[model samples]
Target: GTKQEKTALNMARFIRSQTLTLLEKLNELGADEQADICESLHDHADELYRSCLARFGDDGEN
Candidate 1:
């Protein structure tokens, strides 16, 4: 219903695409750092989910 909601949405989309892009790059190299990056991304996604709940409410769908 306001501005920051859209900002979080945009940030979430950016994170989604960037996460996939990094995954492909890591896949190409089969880097040992894959686990590290995956863990960090998981934490970030968790935080983002909490933020989404704050802004959008605990309603279903997303």
Candidate 2:
């Protein structure tokens, strides 16, 4: 892969990992806190996923 491809891949991986970390944290919280955290995470993930798709196109691989 080229430098740009490598960078994109790294960013995508980081976003995904961060999303999982946030989800784990949400799960560890109490119900009310969890709901708030989860909602925030969902918004973040949506933005990340959209950005990823915009950068790489929708192959549905990720």
Candidate 3:
């Protein structure tokens, strides 16, 4: 509700951009860093599912 919808979308876009930038410079990071990023994104999925109480759909949950 309210302006949160806009903030939610723009932050997602910005975070995607940052994550992509991380991938673009992948070789510069530690060998484990990419895996860490992947793991964090997956964790975010789980957190999102818990917050939504599965209301949106099951595909989103971890």
Candidate 4:
């Protein structure tokens, strides 16, 4: 992978990991505000992965 591709992958991975952490926290708190935050985090995660794919220009099966 190119340097840019590696960076994109790392960024996406970080966003995904943070999203999962937020979800776990939301589950533990069981608050409506936390649920909203979790949903926003999920959307951000999705966007980050999509951006990474756009940068890499590779849609290989995982």
C-alpha positional error of residue 10 in candidate 2 after TM-score superposition, expressed in Å: 0.9
Regions more than 4 Å wrong, model 3: 28-62
- lDDT of candidate 3 over 28-50, digit per residue (tens): 55547775776577557545544
- Cα-based TM-score, every candidate: 0.56, 0.48, 0.44, 0.65
Who is ahead in TM-score, 2 or 4? 4
Which regions in candidate 1 have their CA more than 4 angstroms from the true location?
Answer: 39-54, 57-61
Which segments of model 4 are wrong by more than 4 Å? 57-62
Per-model clash counts, in order, read: 0, 0, 0, 0
- lDDT scores of the candidates, listed in order: 0.69, 0.68, 0.54, 0.78
In candidate 4, what are the lDDT values of residues 1-62, reduced to their tens digit?
58878787778878887888888788788877877878788888988887776777556622
Per-residue CA lDDT of model 1 for 1-62, tens digit only, reads 54777677667767766776776777678776894686578568767866775666535635
Give the Å shift of residue 22 in candidate 4: 1.4
Q: Could you say which candidate leads in TM-score?
A: 4
Candidate 2 residue pairs that clash: none
Please give the lDDT score for candidate 2: 0.68
TM-score of candidate 4 against the unseen true structure: 0.65
RMSD in order of candidates: 3.2, 3.8, 5.9, 2.7
